[PDB]
Design a protein around this ligand. Structure first.
Ligand SMILES: C=C1/C(=C\C=C2/CCC[C@]3(C)[C@@H]([C@H](C)CCCC(C)(C)O)CC[C@@H]23)C[C@@H](O)C[C@@H]1O
Lengths: 239, 10
């Protein structure tokens, strides 16, 4: 059975996400206009979306039970390492199977493989990304599963530079144990079969995706001209 | 070092 503390946790994460994620995508107008005519024409638009998204991820993180206990340094480290992975995760909701693109309800905010390429990212990142999206979409997780995964990703003991591994591990365990218990009680066969293990595997794919992005990000970031198009937050977070 | 993150985390 789902313990009451576990049901509580789920309620909190769902709400956290509802506040942090806007289905309407109204806020997108505020970003620099998307340009699809021209190298890295997409980047200023795309860089603003990412910067926006980083903020939304930071807000979601704070709501997570026990995240507030961690030293400020340990909070910072967890956000810096996971922010790309979470953005990729949350981005699933916009991602459409039919067209293989991220659909933001409007033709102008629809995002395709060429758009991401127009950001200054090679197919090696891109092609694994699309594959991840498909593979995630196929799981067809409940909303409770989706929020829970993001929170378990955000709070990782392994992340480089962590001051207090043991305490971060304790907090993650509670959420993991909440997710396991939820699938068995709340998720029916045959969709329930292998779902925790499959979901865990997706965190591993994200780790690989994080490493690739980072290399690509540095070569992009290294050039002063491209670096000027990034937001201040993005520079600070992504380094 | 990091300022913007610290402010947002509170
Ligand atoms: C963000 C969100 C959205 C899309 C995410 C995308 C679509 C385009 C390609 C993106 C932006 C990927 C890029 C490879 C990111 C590159 C970032 C950078 C250029 C700085 O190195 C990662 C996530 C992808 C929109 C919405 O779903 C909110 C979500 O939160």
């Amino acid at each position: 059975k789902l313990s009451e503390e576990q049901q509580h946790i789920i309620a909190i994460l769902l709400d956290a996400h509802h506040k942090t994620y806007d289905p309407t995508y109204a806020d997108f107008r505020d970003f620099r206009p998307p340009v699809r005519m021209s190298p890295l024409s997409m980047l200023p638009h795309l860089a603003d979306l990412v910067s926006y998204s980083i903020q939304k991820v930071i807000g979601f993180a704070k709501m997570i039970p026990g995240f507030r206990d961690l030293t400020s340094d340990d909070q910072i480290v967890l956000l810096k390492s996971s922010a790309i992975e979470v953005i990729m995760l949350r981005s699933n909701q916009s991602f459409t199977m039919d067209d293989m693109s991220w659909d933001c309800g409007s033709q102008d905010y629809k995002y395709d493989v060429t758009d991401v390429s127009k950001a200054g990212h090679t197919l090696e990142l891109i092609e694994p990304l699309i594959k991840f999206q498909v593979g995630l979409k196929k799981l067809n997780l409940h909303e409770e599963e989706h929020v829970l995964l993001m929170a378990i990703c955000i709070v990782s003991p392994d992340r480089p530079g962590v001051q207090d591994a043991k305490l971060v591990e304790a907090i993650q365990d509670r959420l993991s144990n909440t997710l396991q218990t939820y699938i068995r009680c709340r998720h029916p066969p045959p969709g329930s079969h292998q779902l925790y293990a499959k979901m865990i595997q997706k965190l591993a794919d994200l780790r690989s995706l994080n490493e690739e992005h980072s290399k690509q990000y540095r070569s992009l970031s290294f050039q002063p001209e491209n670096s000027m198009k990034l937001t201040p937050l993005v520079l600070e977070v992504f380094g | 070092e990091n300022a913007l993150l610290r402010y947002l985390l509170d």
